[PDB]
Design a binder for these strands. Sequence first.
RNA 1: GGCCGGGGGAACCGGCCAGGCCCGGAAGGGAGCAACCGUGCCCGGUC
Length: 432
Amino acid sequence: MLENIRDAVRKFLTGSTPYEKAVDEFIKDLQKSLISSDVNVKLVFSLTAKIKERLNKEKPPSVLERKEWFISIVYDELSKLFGGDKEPNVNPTKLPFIIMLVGVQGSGKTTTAGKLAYFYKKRGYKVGLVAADVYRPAAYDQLLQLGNQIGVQVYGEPNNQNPIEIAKKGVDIFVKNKMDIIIVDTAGRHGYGEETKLLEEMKEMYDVLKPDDVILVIDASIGQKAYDLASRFHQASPIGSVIITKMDGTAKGGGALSAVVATGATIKFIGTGEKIDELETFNAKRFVSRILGMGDIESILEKVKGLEEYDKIQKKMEDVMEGKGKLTLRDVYAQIIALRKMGPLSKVLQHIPGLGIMLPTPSEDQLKIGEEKIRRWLAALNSMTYKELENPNIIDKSRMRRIAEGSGLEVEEVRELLEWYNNMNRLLKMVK
RNA sequence: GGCCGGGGGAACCGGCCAGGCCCGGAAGGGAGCAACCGUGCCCGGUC
């Protein structure tokens, strides 16, 4: 399905084939792999659109192959496309806790809970679960298993068709025992469509107990359709976050998670399916990225921020008076990094300015000629304690020759630079 | 004179050694600056 699109990814890392066309196809191509894999479309237009939008309103900051950029963008919107951005907060508000597990008809219904709970114990906490469902059979049962088979008791009431009590009952139990976290799956007679009734149930269910964290769930089996279901409820309870049962358990996915999002919906996990652990957290990227996997750039990318927003320092530095601050003639060497990591060397140098920046400065038609000597200035630095570069004025012949040799460079080179530092500023610092 | 800590040091040659520096085609090694690690390093005790 989609997966094999995440290939279009490197299928793209091919200088052989041209551009633009390369794009749109891919677009459509990826674009295809989606709906085909469930995925609603009404939306799409929007994405595919926004996508376009940008193009005719941007360009990759120089010093960086377009093809790549494209992605950041692609990726970029994949995010928004899906669970845009809000980093779900699945951990303790306080303790203990109330996990109201509202489920349509079964499906992950119970299961889920497991790894969920399961998960948090291998986090180090007094879980606690309860069979909060009496319409469909194997409540405890099938579940019951794991419970012990994981070292986590649980509790319920054979036959016994009546939530609330039992729930209430359970609850305070662990509580009385003072455990830390409770999980309790529930549901009712009529769900999908009669959703109205499902929730209708959760109504009391909720407002009777007084749960802190509440969640619904669904298998991508339903997909984009689901939307609604959940939707009606985001209203019931906005704090209402959810997850999608079965990943490896369908083939449609997308639309599922898609629809979700497109409601302001709130997820947290997903779990491929079987196995007591397949459950996983969740953060678009986490996944989006995941369906593109190798997304380095972001890295090399983010270095811009390193540089771009660092000259920030330069000019004049420190603010106000008194107390200790940060760093600077370190930031010196700091500059370094970014770039090299921010994509290979050279191409960039050329593609962009020296190290000062752009003021009443010296040296020809274009600022530089560090070309090689560059990866030399570096030599040391890392050949020196932190403090050193903070007090770039304690460079005794003694303390340095070691860096000299320690970095492998016969003296000279250094002394022969130390000033390209204490003078830079000198001039640099020449603010009126 | 037995132990955990707040901080705790360039260069009298320490553990891992990046970076680079050097010998050999690549292998892989050679000496080693920081870097964390502790020596050390000053005080409190050590159910």
